[PDB]
Amino acid sequence: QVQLVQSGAEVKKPGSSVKVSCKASGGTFNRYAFSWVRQAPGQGLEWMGGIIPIFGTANYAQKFQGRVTITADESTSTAYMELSSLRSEDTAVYYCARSTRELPEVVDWYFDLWGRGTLVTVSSASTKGPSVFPLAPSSKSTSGGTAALGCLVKDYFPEPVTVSWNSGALTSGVHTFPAVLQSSGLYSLSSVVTVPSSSLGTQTYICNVNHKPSNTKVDKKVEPK
Amino acid sequence: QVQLVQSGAEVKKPGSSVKVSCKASGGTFNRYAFSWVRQAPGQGLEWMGGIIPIFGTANYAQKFQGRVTITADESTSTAYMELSSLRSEDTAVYYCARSTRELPEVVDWYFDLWGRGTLVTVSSASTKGPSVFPLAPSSKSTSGGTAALGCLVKDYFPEPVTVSWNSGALTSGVHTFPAVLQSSGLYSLSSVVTVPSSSLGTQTYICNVNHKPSNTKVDKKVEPKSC
Amino acid sequence: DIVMTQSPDSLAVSLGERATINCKSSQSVLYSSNNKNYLAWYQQKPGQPPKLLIYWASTRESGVPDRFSGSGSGTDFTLTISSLQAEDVAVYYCQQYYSAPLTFGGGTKVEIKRTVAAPSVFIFPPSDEQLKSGTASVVCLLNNFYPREAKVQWKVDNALQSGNSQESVTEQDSKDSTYSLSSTLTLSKADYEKHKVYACEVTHQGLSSPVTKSFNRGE
Amino acid sequence: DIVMTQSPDSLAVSLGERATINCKSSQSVLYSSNNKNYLAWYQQKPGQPPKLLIYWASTRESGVPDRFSGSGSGTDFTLTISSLQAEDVAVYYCQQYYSAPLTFGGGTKVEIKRTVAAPSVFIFPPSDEQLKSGTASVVCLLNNFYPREAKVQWKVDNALQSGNSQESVTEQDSKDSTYSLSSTLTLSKADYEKHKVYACEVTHQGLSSPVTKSFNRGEC
Amino acid sequence: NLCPFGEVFNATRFASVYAWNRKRISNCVADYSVLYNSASFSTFKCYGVSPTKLNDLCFTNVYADSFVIRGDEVRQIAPGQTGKIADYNYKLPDDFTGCVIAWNSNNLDSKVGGNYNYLYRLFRKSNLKPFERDISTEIYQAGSTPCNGVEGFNCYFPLQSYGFQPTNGVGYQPYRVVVLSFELLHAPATVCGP
Amino acid sequence: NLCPFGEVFNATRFASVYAWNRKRISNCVADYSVLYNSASFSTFKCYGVSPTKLNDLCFTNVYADSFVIRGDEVRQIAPGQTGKIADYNYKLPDDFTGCVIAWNSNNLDSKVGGNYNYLYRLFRKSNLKPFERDISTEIYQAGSTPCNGVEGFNCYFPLQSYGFQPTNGVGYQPYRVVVLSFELLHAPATVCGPK
Ligand SMILES: *[C@@H]1O[C@H](CO)[C@@H](O)[C@H](O)[C@H]1NC(C)=O
Ligand SMILES: *[C@@H]1O[C@H](CO)[C@@H](O)[C@H](O)[C@H]1NC(C)=O
């Protein structure tokens, strides 16, 4: 039913401003309370502020006061967060969360519905599209009767990259590893899946690599050599 | 605790000879093993030789044999290294190192105590004071509200030069680059600092260049261009 | 502001055993007027948004399983999982909604303590597509092992390679509570064709002897 | 002589992650009588003498923190730092003391691994004081970038200038773990006035396209 | 023998919609030809009265309600409408018998930098009954913690200001509205057409 | 019958300190008064026995140890002393009962260009016990690596020669030393004074 959809990941040069959206699809929007909770990489949750759109006035955390501006557009059921004077520390994932009660009742600010998150990366570097290479199975990837195969998503910036297999039809036995920062400043990631060796030459395995900040959509067929 | 004090830095014309001292201040001296380790600028460590003073016999590396002479004065707790027939490649920092064990125990030549180093520079140039020219900030040095500025320390010999800003009051955003040896045998380096572009018209930025080998202390004001 | 302190930072519990998480508030969140504690518990699986577990420090959200419990009053609170399941490995946060600014706890990572499992090792030669680019990457895969501590060494013609490898480790699996590792050895096409045997040796507690999976360039 | 080879020449490791350094000796340094390896590890931060970390290839010197570990025997040895700290950025050497001559390794530079950062480019025309002296220096500044690998080309009236530039690179910064580079084009006052546009073109991993910062001689 | 409509339309200052003013019109004859021949009105719609009979109808009492709203909110001043203005500021009955007149007043009610003198009510616990005025400025207490008449977290001021700037789009410009209410009470008619 | 003290003091050649020679004096009559009342000795100090009373005391055996050391090293020939000679070449016991005699011999043991025939031990693993002679010339192993009897790295010859030149200062000139030890053994006295 009701879901909160956030804008795509962005990269912003330090000192600029970023605006992230949050659309509520399928329920009331005006009488709820929408907050923005920030989570720096490896760190905890941090409340930035919130707003009840019907009153239009937002309440911020004292830490972000003056740099964050939280608004809402009641005609489109969308809540916005704008963070100005971006710094290195502002690199984090920005979630939008909705209160459990509506305005006619008593609105206590504990959140029942959440957004999938928007990662904002703050650096002077510019976006680079990844290269997607296949990890072909062979007799050297057959330590058991089951063979492993995957694709390597290498040399991309910034985060993140989404990797699915067979357009989401294949999910069992799939391992998509967290990105690793390489010797250069660029990220790399690999996604592997284990399948029976009999089906190596007769079945299809497609990598569905999407890189939001660079508009890079790659489909690669992992075929044995 | 105990520390090894070495002679001052020297400048020698090619083909001449240099003698470097290393006095051990603290503890016994004769029963230790004192070595001389050389490090050319930007290069790794190179063992030249050593001596256990109580036995008087020194052991050298075969490469420098005939050019280096390592001795020790047991009465003054001082170890000497004399390198004759000096060449351009011999320009390096000469370290003095002491073994971890004394002679009654087993003296294996791995070194726990080091001296701060003695710089020997071998060049045909004679000592020269630096010239300090301003690298004025302009609209071409102002990326997004921050301005970059510095001063260029050119044509000095030998190393080193100390560069501070505003007599040490300004240290944030300061970058002093390592010197580069020029074709003419003279060194040069630049010290740059990034400052807010708004403060260009209200703040003064002074370069404090000190070159001890020439008794040259220069203060230069970098004045903004606002161009 | 009311700062929220959790204890411990992390704890390991076997399947079906009891897990206890603490949350301490610098000021009492028990409102004198309604006699209710303005405290909530959240669950955050890796890569996912937080999930509401407990509110009013004792009330479960609809859909939360019965093994999750909330207790405490005033400044000391407790989240209890009566029998920890594989699908419960996450970081748990406590939040106060008594006053602004709303503050969360430091979080507590719970992981499953499980029996030793040996990894299945796989090796992937460089792709032909990447070779045309001028670089060659060899991937070594460690699949479904426990504990996570594992050593992967890259040997090229029986020579130790150290500066040209990067490895990544997954979070603990939600079904078998195992880990998986992928080390990537990246070389230029020039150096890659200078050698023949490319091996990755794996050391793990579940292996009596180190497992080596190798291949020869050109096979 | 026993040649000591280290690998790699340089490596980047993130804070709190593991760093491993290798040392290879052309002859075995394991004495059969003592069953111990005559290898020591040193650490040399810039501007300082080397510091003894490990001896006997596994024994730590008093005062060295427990994060440093030494393993290996014979000809293959390894220095490991379990959790890299900011105060661990240095060059690490291995030494053998089995026989004379005492030989060190080539050294291994450990640097902090950071995300890619594009350089901000600045250009400085020659000063009026230096022009009166008969020479002209043009300085191009690359500020706060990572990795250190960067290409700087001097274009003069859209022509590549070579042989009259020298560049120096700072140590890794202790705050943002970035580098800074300065290329200096030095010409006589005569050659400087033979041209109009002085440009500095920069290629870096953090730049999608080369950044060019130029000026016209005589403006400012 | 004429109604004082000039006191309403040509007023110097108009009230905010949440505090709409009502002027009693009685003991006179209303000529709707004069209203159409007065100015250029963007909205002139009548309800509950047949077009033929409007010029020949008598009423007990007439109320003239005046206020200022946004441009695109004028559509809410009509029977059976919903929105921010209709629910919380000015509600007409579903059986409304009268005329609604509106015209753009950007040359009067918009100032450079924003005219912040006109307000509207953001929210109310219950929707306004027809012809109900609420000028309370009590701070809404959304949360459990009391507000004590201070704006803050879970404590919102119930009134918001219009950003009437001359450069705004037509939908966001000030519009002066006058709602004429016709009362059909069993009393002698104080306002007629002929 | 006179004692052959002339064979010791007036000997043509003296031994190096590391290989000090000991002459047993027995079966004769010794007149110690002439030695103490002589005018050719620069150092004449006795311990545990008064110099005058020696001429009326009997002893079982008398040992005359003779060697040549440096001038400033003569102070080390005494009980409870430490130094290069006392620790590694010639140590007297803390209960020494005897006399130490020394005299300058620059006119005999110094040669033009340096007399390199006199040697001393540079270092020893353990200090010498009282009246212990060490004539070993094995190469000292300072390090763990064995020496195999070859001088080189961490392998040093244990003996060094004196640079006895006639132009040296008095503290560096050769000095001949004679140490008379008197033995109180439980045997008939073979040497007495003119008592
Ligand atoms: C308002 O004033 C204008 C001119 O001053 C006049 O024509 C108009 O009739 C007036 N309005 C009314 C309702 O009388
Ligand atoms: C040694 O020779 C000198 C030379 O006159 C002589 O006086 C002395 O008696 C001799 N014997 C001894 C024991 O000194």
Side-chain angles (χ1 to χ4, degrees), chain A residues 2-225, chain B, chain C residues 1-218, chain D, chain E residues 1-54 57-194, chain F residues 1-194:
Chain A
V2 294
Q3 58 178 355
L4 281 36
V5 194
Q6 304 187 204
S7 62
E10 307 178 31
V11 54
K12 281 296 188 299
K13 301 296 175 66
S16 66
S17 179
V18 60
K19 198 175 183 181
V20 178
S21 73
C22 174
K23 192 216 319 170
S25 303
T28 314
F29 170 84
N30 302 23
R31 303 186 304 279
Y32 285 96
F34 287 85
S35 297
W36 288 97
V37 181
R38 184 174 72 121
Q39 187 180 41
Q43 307 296 328
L45 307 171
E46 199 167 10
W47 183 74
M48 301 186 59
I51 181 181
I52 298 184
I54 188 70
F55 279 119
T57 51
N59 306 133
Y60 314 89
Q62 192 76 357
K63 172 175 182 178
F64 304 101
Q65 189 101 32
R67 302 189 321 111
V68 68
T69 303
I70 299 182
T71 53
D73 187 3
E74 311 187 46
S75 61
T76 65
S77 297
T78 309
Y80 299 103
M81 187 225 49
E82 182 172 353
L83 189 61
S84 65
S85 304
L86 283 169
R87 304 151 54 86
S88 183
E89 50 156 317
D90 296 323
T91 295
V93 176
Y94 291 76
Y95 293 109
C96 65
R98 190 194 71 180
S99 61
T100 183
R101 306 287 179 174
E102 310 210 38
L103 191 61
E105 304 186 12
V106 183
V107 181
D108 296 319
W109 293 54
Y110 61 96
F111 317 102
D112 209 340
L113 183 47
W114 290 75
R116 293 174 68 174
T118 290
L119 177 57
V120 176
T121 314
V122 183
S123 92
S124 50
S126 47
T127 66
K128 181 181 180 302
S131 293
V132 181
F133 308 110
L135 298 181
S138 303
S139 58
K140 273 69 184 179
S141 68
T142 53
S143 70
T146 53
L149 57 90
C151 62
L152 168 66
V153 184
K154 192 175 182 300
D155 300 331
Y156 70 97
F157 179 87
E159 294 254 39
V161 154
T162 64
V163 183
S164 70
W165 283 89
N166 291 345
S167 300
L170 177 61
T171 59
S172 184
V174 180
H175 284 291
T176 301
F177 292 86
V180 56
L181 185 60
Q182 291 178 141
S183 333
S184 59
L186 309 180
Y187 293 95
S188 183
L189 165 155
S190 53
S191 181
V192 304
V193 54
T194 50
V195 299
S197 295
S198 57
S199 69
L200 284 180
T202 57
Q203 311 309 344
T204 64
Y205 301 103
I206 307 297
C207 267
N208 303 122
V209 184
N210 280 34
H211 189 212
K212 297 181 181 180
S214 62
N215 304 331
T216 298
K217 296 185 178 182
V218 177
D219 297 323
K220 269 300 177 302
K221 180 183 179 64
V222 180
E223 200 172 359
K225 290 185 175 68
Chain B
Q1 190 206 356
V2 292
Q3 57 180 355
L4 287 181
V5 289
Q6 305 187 205
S7 62
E10 307 180 31
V11 182
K12 282 296 187 299
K13 300 294 177 172
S16 66
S17 53
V18 60
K19 196 176 183 181
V20 177
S21 74
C22 174
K23 192 214 182 57
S25 302
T28 53
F29 170 83
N30 300 23
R31 305 181 178 193
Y32 285 96
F34 288 85
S35 298
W36 287 97
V37 181
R38 185 175 73 162
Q39 189 180 42
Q43 309 297 329
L45 308 171
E46 198 168 9
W47 183 76
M48 300 187 59
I51 182 180
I52 299 184
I54 188 184
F55 283 121
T57 296
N59 306 134
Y60 314 88
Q62 59 176 5
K63 311 181 308 181
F64 304 102
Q65 191 159 329
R67 303 186 42 247
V68 69
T69 303
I70 297 183
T71 51
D73 186 4
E74 312 185 47
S75 60
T76 65
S77 296
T78 309
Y80 298 102
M81 190 265 312
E82 183 174 354
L83 186 59
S84 63
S85 305
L86 284 169
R87 305 150 180 175
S88 183
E89 314 93 307
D90 298 324
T91 298
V93 175
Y94 288 77
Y95 291 108
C96 171
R98 191 196 71 181
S99 60
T100 59
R101 309 290 178 175
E102 309 209 38
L103 190 60
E105 305 186 12
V106 183
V107 181
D108 296 320
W109 293 44
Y110 60 98
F111 320 103
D112 67 324
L113 183 50
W114 289 73
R116 294 178 70 265
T118 292
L119 177 59
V120 176
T121 313
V122 183
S123 162
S124 294
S126 47
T127 65
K128 179 182 179 302
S131 295
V132 181
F133 309 111
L135 298 180
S138 58
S139 175
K140 273 300 173 164
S141 313
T142 53
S143 286
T146 53
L149 59 91
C151 63
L152 168 66
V153 185
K154 191 174 181 47
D155 300 331
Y156 72 93
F157 176 87
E159 293 254 38
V161 286
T162 306
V163 184
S164 70
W165 284 91
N166 294 347
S167 300
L170 179 62
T171 60
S172 184
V174 179
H175 282 132
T176 300
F177 291 88
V180 290
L181 182 60
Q182 295 174 141
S183 57
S184 57
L186 308 181
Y187 295 92
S188 308
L189 66 84
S190 313
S191 182
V192 65
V193 55
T194 49
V195 299
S197 176
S198 179
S199 296
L200 281 178
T202 190
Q203 304 299 340
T204 59
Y205 302 104
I206 309 297
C207 266
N208 303 121
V209 184
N210 179 26
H211 185 236
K212 292 186 178 182
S214 61
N215 302 330
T216 298
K217 297 185 178 181
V218 177
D219 298 326
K220 189 64 178 184
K221 181 183 179 183
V222 181
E223 306 222 25
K225 289 185 174 177
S226 86
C227 170
Chain C
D1 59 308
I2 307 176
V3 295
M4 311 301 290
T5 304
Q6 304 189 212
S7 175
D9 291 355
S10 293
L11 59 84
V13 169
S14 300
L15 284 79
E17 296 301 322
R18 181 168 66 89
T20 284
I21 304 178
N22 295 116
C23 178
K24 184 84 53 59
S25 64
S26 57
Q27 303 174 12
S28 176
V29 298
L30 174 61
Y31 193 15
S32 322
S33 302
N34 55 31
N35 194 15
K36 296 191 299 185
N37 306 268
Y38 287 66
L39 179 124
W41 286 98
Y42 294 92
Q43 178 195 60
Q44 189 184 22
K45 299 286 177 63
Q48 288 185 350
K51 179 176 183 178
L52 181 59
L53 293 184
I54 305 293
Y55 55 100
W56 301 126
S58 63
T59 303
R60 291 193 312 273
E61 177 65 22
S62 300
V64 178
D66 310 338
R67 50 180 181 273
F68 293 82
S69 156
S71 293
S73 180
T75 65
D76 186 61
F77 299 88
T78 300
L79 176 68
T80 312
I81 305 179
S82 54
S83 69
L84 194 60
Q85 302 299 120
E87 60 153 346
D88 295 334
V89 178
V91 178
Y92 297 84
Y93 297 92
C94 60
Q95 181 211 346
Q96 62 88 13
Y97 48 96
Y98 187 21
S99 61
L102 295 66
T103 54
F104 293 88
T108 296
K109 181 157 205 166
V110 305
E111 287 184 323
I112 288 298
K113 197 170 65 175
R114 68 147 292 164
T115 59
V116 192
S120 293
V121 187
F122 312 82
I123 185 170
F124 294 100
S127 177
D128 283 358
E129 302 172 355
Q130 190 185 9
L131 288 179
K132 198 175 184 289
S133 308
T135 57
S137 294
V138 192
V139 179
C140 192
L141 172 61
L142 284 61
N143 212 39
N144 301 117
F145 59 93
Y146 184 91
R148 68 181 302 168
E149 288 71 19
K151 176 171 293 183
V152 173
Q153 188 65 32
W154 282 101
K155 279 187 168 61
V156 173
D157 288 331
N158 204 24
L160 296 177
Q161 291 282 14
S162 66
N164 40 24
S165 56
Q166 295 284 344
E167 66 187 28
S168 173
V169 181
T170 55
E171 73 287 353
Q172 199 173 21
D173 199 0
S174 57
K175 285 185 180 181
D176 52 8
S177 295
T178 56
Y179 295 94
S180 291
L181 191 150
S182 76
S183 185
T184 305
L185 172 68
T186 303
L187 297 174
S188 71
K189 185 187 181 55
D191 286 355
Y192 175 67
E193 297 178 353
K194 286 173 57 181
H195 305 92
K196 188 177 174 181
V197 178
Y198 287 83
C200 65
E201 180 176 343
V202 177
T203 304
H204 192 260
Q205 188 187 3
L207 303 172
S208 55
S209 295
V211 169
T212 306
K213 308 281 283 182
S214 62
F215 71 92
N216 297 25
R217 177 185 65 93
Chain D
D1 315 324
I2 306 176
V3 188
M4 308 298 289
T5 304
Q6 305 189 212
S7 55
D9 290 355
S10 170
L11 63 151
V13 172
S14 298
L15 284 172
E17 294 180 342
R18 179 168 269 93
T20 56
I21 306 177
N22 295 337
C23 179
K24 183 84 166 184
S25 63
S26 58
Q27 303 175 12
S28 176
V29 297
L30 174 62
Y31 196 16
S32 65
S33 177
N34 286 15
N35 196 15
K36 50 182 55 183
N37 307 269
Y38 289 65
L39 178 125
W41 287 98
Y42 296 91
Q43 177 194 61
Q44 188 184 22
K45 299 188 187 176
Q48 287 185 350
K51 175 180 181 179
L52 181 59
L53 293 184
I54 301 190
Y55 55 99
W56 300 128
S58 63
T59 303
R60 291 192 310 272
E61 179 66 21
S62 179
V64 179
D66 46 359
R67 315 179 280 99
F68 294 95
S69 62
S71 56
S73 180
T75 65
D76 315 332
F77 299 99
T78 300
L79 176 69
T80 311
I81 308 177
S82 54
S83 286
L84 193 62
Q85 301 298 120
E87 61 270 3
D88 293 334
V89 179
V91 179
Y92 295 84
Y93 297 91
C94 60
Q95 180 211 345
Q96 61 87 11
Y97 48 96
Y98 190 21
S99 62
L102 297 178
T103 54
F104 291 85
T108 297
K109 181 87 178 59
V110 174
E111 60 151 355
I112 292 301
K113 195 170 65 176
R114 191 209 181 286
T115 58
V116 52
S120 48
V121 186
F122 311 109
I123 185 169
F124 295 86
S127 57
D128 281 357
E129 301 87 320
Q130 190 184 9
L131 287 180
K132 289 305 182 66
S133 64
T135 58
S137 294
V138 193
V139 178
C140 190
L141 172 61
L142 284 61
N143 211 40
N144 302 323
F145 60 94
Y146 182 93
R148 166 196 277 255
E149 289 73 20
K151 175 173 293 183
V152 172
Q153 305 204 24
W154 280 100
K155 277 187 166 61
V156 172
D157 291 330
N158 205 24
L160 294 73
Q161 281 278 14
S162 309
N164 276 42
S165 56
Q166 295 180 251
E167 64 189 29
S168 56
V169 183
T170 53
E171 208 80 24
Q172 200 173 22
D173 200 0
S174 56
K175 182 181 63 63
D176 50 8
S177 296
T178 58
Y179 295 97
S180 291
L181 191 150
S182 77
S183 183
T184 305
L185 172 69
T186 304
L187 299 174
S188 71
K189 184 187 181 184
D191 287 355
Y192 174 68
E193 297 177 353
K194 286 173 174 291
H195 308 94
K196 299 180 179 181
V197 178
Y198 286 85
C200 171
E201 179 175 342
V202 179
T203 303
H204 191 261
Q205 189 73 256
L207 304 172
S208 57
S209 296
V211 168
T212 305
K213 198 143 289 286
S214 62
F215 71 92
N216 296 25
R217 177 185 63 92
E219 279 185 321
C220 67
Chain E
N1 268 316
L2 193 62
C3 288
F5 281 152
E7 299 182 3
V8 179
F9 295 88
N10 283 332
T12 286
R13 198 181 186 270
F14 267 60
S16 295
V17 56
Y18 88 95
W20 50 278
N21 283 331
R22 167 167 292 188
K23 178 64 178 180
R24 188 189 187 96
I25 307 298
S26 54
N27 304 326
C28 59
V29 46
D31 183 19
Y32 312 99
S33 301
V34 181
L35 289 180
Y36 287 104
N37 294 327
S38 299
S40 58
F41 296 143
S42 64
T43 290
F44 207 133
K45 52 199 184 178
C46 299
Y47 302 85
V49 178
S50 293
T52 309
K53 302 300 299 182
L54 177 61
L57 274 179
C58 287
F59 308 107
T60 295
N61 206 262
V62 174
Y63 292 112
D65 307 333
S66 52
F67 52 82
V68 170
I69 57 183
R70 213 198 299 175
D72 53 9
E73 294 174 344
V74 182
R75 61 100 185 167
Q76 298 183 22
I77 308 298
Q81 284 285 355
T82 178
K84 182 144 292 218
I85 299 298
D87 299 330
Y88 307 139
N89 293 270
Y90 185 83
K91 180 63 177 170
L92 287 180
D94 297 356
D95 62 331
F96 174 70
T97 309
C99 302
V100 177
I101 306 93
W103 68 94
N104 189 304
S105 60
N106 192 263
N107 47 327
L108 290 321
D109 299 321
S110 67
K111 202 60 168 295
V112 180
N115 178 20
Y116 301 97
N117 292 14
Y118 289 104
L119 316 177
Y120 64 92
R121 180 167 298 278
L122 285 166
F123 182 79
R124 199 167 178 266
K125 274 187 172 191
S126 187
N127 287 15
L128 281 190
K129 302 177 187 181
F131 296 143
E132 181 180 11
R133 189 190 299 104
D134 184 6
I135 56 183
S136 76
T137 51
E138 286 278 21
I139 289 191
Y140 193 99
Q141 182 182 340
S144 305
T145 47
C147 295
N148 300 327
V150 176
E151 297 184 20
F153 178 68
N154 257 339
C155 291
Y156 310 95
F157 194 74
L159 298 183
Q160 183 56 40
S161 188
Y162 286 104
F164 284 146
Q165 306 184 10
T167 57
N168 294 135
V170 54
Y172 295 86
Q173 291 181 21
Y175 272 77
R176 293 187 171 187
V177 180
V178 177
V179 178
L180 300 186
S181 314
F182 305 149
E183 185 175 357
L184 314 174
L185 198 145
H186 294 270
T190 58
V191 179
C192 294
Chain F
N1 196 15
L2 297 182
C3 288
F5 280 153
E7 300 182 4
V8 178
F9 295 89
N10 284 332
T12 61
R13 301 174 176 86
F14 268 60
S16 295
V17 56
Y18 89 98
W20 48 275
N21 201 39
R22 166 167 291 188
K23 176 64 178 180
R24 189 188 82 264
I25 308 299
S26 54
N27 304 326
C28 59
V29 179
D31 182 77
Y32 313 99
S33 64
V34 294
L35 290 181
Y36 185 75
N37 295 327
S38 171
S40 56
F41 296 141
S42 65
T43 290
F44 203 130
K45 187 169 176 57
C46 298
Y47 304 85
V49 284
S50 178
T52 56
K53 302 180 175 183
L54 294 181
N55 299 272
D56 45 70
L57 276 178
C58 286
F59 306 107
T60 296
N61 268 4
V62 174
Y63 291 109
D65 306 332
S66 53
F67 50 82
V68 170
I69 56 182
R70 214 198 300 173
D72 53 9
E73 293 175 343
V74 182
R75 60 169 295 268
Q76 297 183 22
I77 310 298
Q81 282 286 357
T82 58
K84 182 143 292 219
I85 303 299
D87 299 330
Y88 308 139
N89 294 269
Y90 187 82
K91 182 64 176 72
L92 288 180
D94 295 356
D95 62 331
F96 175 68
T97 60
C99 303
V100 175
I101 307 161
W103 67 93
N104 189 304
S105 59
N106 193 87
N107 45 327
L108 290 321
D109 298 321
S110 172
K111 297 301 296 178
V112 181
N115 177 19
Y116 298 96
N117 292 14
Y118 285 103
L119 317 177
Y120 66 91
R121 182 167 301 280
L122 285 167
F123 183 80
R124 199 167 179 266
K125 277 185 172 61
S126 186
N127 288 16
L128 280 189
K129 302 176 60 185
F131 293 145
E132 180 180 9
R133 191 193 300 104
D134 183 6
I135 57 183
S136 189
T137 51
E138 65 167 358
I139 288 84
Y140 194 100
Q141 183 181 340
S144 304
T145 286
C147 294
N148 301 328
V150 177
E151 296 80 359
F153 172 68
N154 257 339
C155 294
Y156 313 97
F157 195 75
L159 297 184
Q160 181 55 40
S161 187
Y162 285 104
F164 283 148
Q165 304 183 9
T167 57
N168 293 136
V170 53
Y172 293 86
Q173 292 180 21
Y175 271 77
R176 292 187 171 186
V177 182
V178 176
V179 177
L180 299 186
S181 49
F182 304 143
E183 187 175 358
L184 315 174
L185 198 57
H186 42 283
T190 58
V191 283
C192 295

